[PDB]
Structures are given as C-alpha cells and as structure tokens.
Ligand binder design. Structure first.
Ligand SMILES: O=C1O[C@H](CO)[C@H](O)[C@H](O)[C@H]1O
Ligand SMILES: [Mg+2]
Ligand code: NA
Ligand code: NA
Lengths: 210, 211
C-alpha cells in the first residue's frame, strides 16, 4: 500500500506562477520499473557531421551502476527499420580526464554512419539505437533504447541552422490543457493537436512553460 | 577634389565633408575593368594619394572616398589600405561593387530604398533597414546618394528620415543633388534661357538628366 500526501502549495509554487489554471494532484502517470542491480543508469546520444553532412559519427556515452567488472560490456547498435547500419562494442573505463584518472563506470561508443538520413520537421527520419549492457561472453543483463534523429543545430553568422540550412520557425505555444480532464494529457489529445498543427502549416512548438 | 577654398569655408562655417578622389569609370564594361587592372593602379593611386596629401589638415574633411562608380577592383583594396595606413584619423568609404565591399568602412549605397529591396544580380540594393542586419554585417550605413531631386521630386523623403531617427546605425545620407547643371544660352533677342543636354549640338547626350 502506497500513501501519497500531495500539498497544493509549497515553496515550489513560487517558481510556478505561469498564466494558467492553478490545479493540483497526481496529474501524470505513476509506474513501477524494475532494473538489475548492475544497470544502465544513464546514456547520452550525439550526432556530429562533416561539412556536407555526407558522413556522421554517433557517440553514445553510457553510464552504469552496481558491480563493476572486467567482463562487463556495452554494445550500441543502430537500426534503420530491421537493418542494422552500425554497431560498436566496448568494456567500461572511459578515457583519462584528470590526475585521478577517468570514469571506470563509463564508456563511450563511436559509430560511423555514411550518408545518414537526416531528421527535420519536413522529413522526420529516425534510426533506432539499442544500448545493451552485457557480459563479454554474450549474456544480456538489460537493454535500453531511443529514437535517434540525425540533425545538427547550430547558430552561425547570426542564423539558427538545421542541418546547415536557415530555419523559418512557424511555431505556436502549447500548454497541456483539456476542458474535461484539466492538465492531464492523453495520447489522443496529443496526436490530435500535432495533426492539427501540421495541417495548419506549423513546424514548431514551445513547451510553455514547463 | 574641390577648389581649395571650399574646405576652408567648410572648416569655418561648419559642414562635415566627404573628400572624394577624382576616379570614375562608369562607362567601362564591366564597371571595374580598369580598377581591377594593375596597370591602372599607378594612375589611380596618384588620384587618391595626392588628394590626401593636400587636404589632410582640414578638420571639415571627416571621411575619405576612393571615387565613384568604378565597380570594385583590387586597386580599390590597395588604395583603401594605403589611406588607413597613412591616416587613421578618418574613415574610408566607397560605394562601387555593392556598397559594402572590403574597400569601405561604411555601407554607403546609392538610391537604396527604405523598406523595398531591389535585388539586382551581384550588386543588390537592399532596403536600408534590412541591409544593416544581414548576417555578419556590423558597419554603419550612410547613403552616398539618395532622394534624387530631379524636377518635381523628393516624394517619400520623410520616409528616409523617419528611418534615420529610429535606427541608430542608419546615420543619414547625401541627397542627389544640390544644384541643377543647366547652362545659360541666349535667344535672338538676347534673352537668357536655361539649357541642358543636347542644346549645344552635343550628341550623343543625355538631355535633362544633368538637372
Ligand atoms: O507574456 C505572456 O503572455 C501570455 C498572455 O496570454 C501568457 O501570459 C504567457 O504565459 C506569458 O509569457
Ligand atoms: Mg506570466
Ligand atoms: Na540613426
Ligand atoms: Na544626373
């Protein structure tokens, strides 16, 4: 039996003075997750490109918690549909960063990807990255994953560029609101909003203000 | 370069002067055919250097000009640098080749409009408000020529000034121009009348475009 005492007001309220309905309660999903003692505690995915985006390097930094051993390994494989385009395996122990050494509980995989399909609101090309925590000899401990969008966002010479091209933001601010359920969001409402936004030529949204 | 007395009078009466080298090759095709030719560098340099050596002590002169309508050639970059080198007390400007080349410290377009762009190939005349904020541009903008006062003209003059006052980097310009270039001729009765292009048998000529 869980017992949750939710307070409407707290010092946290001072930082939540957004122009909207002031409500309270457990308005988002509550779930139970089970992780192995030796687990993936965090992972970052980055994509760098060459001048003409004809080549890319996907770097995945993976962090673990628990029993650190020489047999541990991390394998990051990249998929395009059911086709594995790239894959890298390595043991833990990041590069040396300071006089005390490096992160023995971390590893960074670098995967080369030629002529990658670039992500944008125009064409949302996505790849699937699977992060496997396992023993060198083949035993999977646990796996995590995310959709990877190959795109570069940078500001150059005063212009915001996406994959090297200047963006023209056709955006709108969107609060999480429902006339019946309040600030509780559901998939159907989210999908409806996105379809309506894209149907009306919007390509961007700002999470006002949270 | 003007008659020497002009600067003395501008010094004493108070007028900011733009001293310009006697260099204009507008009729060439392209406009920079000679200014980009190193063989014409010597003749051009004398027109710039001898000007600076003559007028550099005049306080009314606040800006040096490399000339007018001669496109943009390497000779302009060289002479631009020569002046910056011998006299760092005054900015150097030049409109040829786009009004914003490497040969000018000031974006000095001619007849660039306030809000409307004129996207000419290679040498576009952007609306002055838009010119200022082009990616990477940081220089001030002063039109070397604007509000062409030919005949019944100067319509929209107020639009320029509303912009000059609102935009810090839009610091004005020079109207084109001061006085009609008409010449006096006399009829049979001996009465005087104002004449222009072609009234002297001159041809080809561009008629009233001198007024
Ligand atoms: O400045 C604003 O204007 C909007 C007015 O509806 C709303 O209050 C936004 O949250 C606030 O950022
Ligand atoms: Mg507010
Ligand atoms: Na101004
Ligand atoms: Na004229």
């Amino acid at each position: 039996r869980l017992a949750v005492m939710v307070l409407r007001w707290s010092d946290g309220s001072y930082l939540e003075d957004q122009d909207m309905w002031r409500m309270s309660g457990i308005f988002r999903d509550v779930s139970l997750l089970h992780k192995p003692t030796t687990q993936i505690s965090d992972f970052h995915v980055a994509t760098r490109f060459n001048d003409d985006f004809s080549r890319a390097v996907l770097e995945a930094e993976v962090q673990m918690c628990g029993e650190l051993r020489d047999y541990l390994r991390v394998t990051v494989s990249l998929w395009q549909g059911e086709t594995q385009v790239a894959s890298g395996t390595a043991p833990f122990g990041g590069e040396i960063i300071d006089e005390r050494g490096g992160y023995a509980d971390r590893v960074t995989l670098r995967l080369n990807v030629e002529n990658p399909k670039l992500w944008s609101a125009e064409i949302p090309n996505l790849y699937r990255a699977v992060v496997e925590l396992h023993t060198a000899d083949g035993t999977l401990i646990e796996a995590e994953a995310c959709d990877v969008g190959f795109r570069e966002v940078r500001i150059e010479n005063g212009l915001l560029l996406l994959n090297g091209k200047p963006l023209l933001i056709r955006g709108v601010n969107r609060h999480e609101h429902h006339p019946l359920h309040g600030q509780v969001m559901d998939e159907q409402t989210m999908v409806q909003d996105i379809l309506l936004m894209k149907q009306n030529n919007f390509n961007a949204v700002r999470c006002s203000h949270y | 370069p003007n008659h020497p007395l002009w600067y003395t009078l501008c010094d004493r009466y108070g007028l900011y002067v733009v001293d310009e080298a006697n260099i204009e090759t507008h009729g060439m095709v392209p406009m920079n055919r000679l200014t980009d030719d190193p063989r014409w560098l010597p003749a051009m340099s004398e027109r710039v250097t001898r000007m600076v050596q003559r007028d550099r002590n005049h306080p009314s002169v606040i800006i040096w000009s490399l000339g007018n309508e001669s496109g943009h050639g390497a000779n302009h970059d060289a002479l631009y640098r020569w002046i910056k080198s011998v006299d760092p007390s005054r900015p150097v400007q030049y409109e040829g080749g786009g009004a914003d080349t490497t040969a000018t410290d000031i974006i000095c377009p001619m007849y660039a409009r306030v809000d409307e762009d004129q996207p000419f190939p290679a040498v576009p005349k952007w609306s002055i408000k838009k010119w200022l904020s082009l990616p990477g541009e940081t220089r001030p903008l002063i039109l070397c020529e604007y509000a062409h006062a030919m005949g019944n003209s100067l319509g929209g003059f107020a639009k320029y000034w509303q912009a000059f006052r609102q935009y810090p980097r839009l610091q004005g310009g020079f109207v084109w121009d001061w006085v009609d270039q008409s010449l006096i001729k006399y009829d049979e009765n001996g009465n005087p009348w104002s004449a222009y292009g072609g009234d002297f048998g001159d041809t080809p000529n561009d008629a009233q475009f001198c007024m």
